[PDB]
Amino acid sequence: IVGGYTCGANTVPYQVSLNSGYHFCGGSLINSQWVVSAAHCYKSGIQVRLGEDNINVVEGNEQFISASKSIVHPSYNSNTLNNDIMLIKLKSAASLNSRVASISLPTSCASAGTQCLISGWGNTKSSGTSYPDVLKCLKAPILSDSSCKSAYPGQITSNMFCAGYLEGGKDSCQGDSGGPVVCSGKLQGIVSWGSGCAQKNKPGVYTKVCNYVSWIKQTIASN
Numbered sequence: 657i658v659g660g661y662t663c664g665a666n667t668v669p670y671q672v673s674l675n676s677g678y679h680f681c682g683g684s685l686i687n688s689q690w691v692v693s694a695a696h697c698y699k700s701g702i703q704v705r706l707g708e709d710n711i712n713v714v715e716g717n718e719q720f721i722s723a724s725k726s727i728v729h730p731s732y733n734s735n736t737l738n739n740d741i742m743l744i745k746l747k748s749a750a751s752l753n754s755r756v757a758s759i760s761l762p763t764s765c766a767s768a769g770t771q772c773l774i775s776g777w778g779n780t781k782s783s784g785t786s787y788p789d790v791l792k793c794l795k796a797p798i799l800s801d802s803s804c805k806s807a808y809p810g811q812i813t814s815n816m817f818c819a820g821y822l823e824g825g826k827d828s829c830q831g832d833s834g835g836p837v838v839c840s841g842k843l844q845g846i847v848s849w850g851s852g853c854a855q856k857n858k859p860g861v862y863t864k865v866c867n868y869v870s871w872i873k874q875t876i877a878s879n
């Protein structure tokens with residue numbers, strides 16, 4: 657997160673860290689045994705870490721659960737990142753309390769201008785790499801589809817939306833991939849891609865979760 661602030665320990669209880677010996681992507685807890693992340697975060701050897709704040713110190717509240725399986729969307733395209741969503745099922749269910757909690761899936765898509773909260777342990781510098789120990793947050797609005805398509809001509813599908821600031825300075829970045837974009841208590845986006853981080857007129861692009869709620873429900877109901 658570039659231009660963001662320290663969220664405060666456990667203030668984003670549905671945020672998870674995907675770990676393979678180090679933090680590589682974020683994700684969102686949607687029920688006690690399922691997490692939602694981005695298809696490009698897929699790898700084997702994933703341990704899901706819940707209740708985290710400092711990812712390098714065990715401070716208490718953490719729950720480390722191995723993924724029993726990851727389900728990448730069958731139509732995911734790694735070259736356009738269209739359908740960039742993945743579901744991870746946990747080996748055991750997580751103990752939910754006030755520090756670890758799930759986030760609701762949306763019943764409707766959000767509109768331009770909606771203010772959302774984006775969080776993650778990704779890079780904090782637009783020019784260079786500084787990775788934080790604690791969770792960073794950024795409040796950003798959903799942009800109109802015309803400005804988004806005007807910024808990335810021919811690269812935005814209907815399963816994507818842009819959120820952020822065209823002036824530059826505040827944005828999600830590498831390490832934040834797979835994490836949440838929550839608007840009004842509902843998970844509306846997943847951090848997917850962008851050009852550099854916090855560059856002028858190059859806002860972040862997010863996977864539009866309202867387009868996949870039945871796919872998520874049907875997939876969880878059968879696995």
Ligand SMILES: NC(=[NH2+])c1ccc2[nH]c(-c3ncccc3[O-])nc2c1
Binds near residue numbers: 828831
């Ligand atoms: N500018 C952004 N909003 C953005 C967000 C997530 C990103 N993730 C990545 C990324 N880059 C290199 C390897 C993996 C990644 O997820 N770039 C990203 C850029």
Ligand SMILES: [Ca+2]
Binds near residue numbers: 708
């Ligand atoms: Ca920790």
Ligand SMILES: [Cl-]
Binds near residue numbers: 809810811
């Ligand atoms: Cl276009």
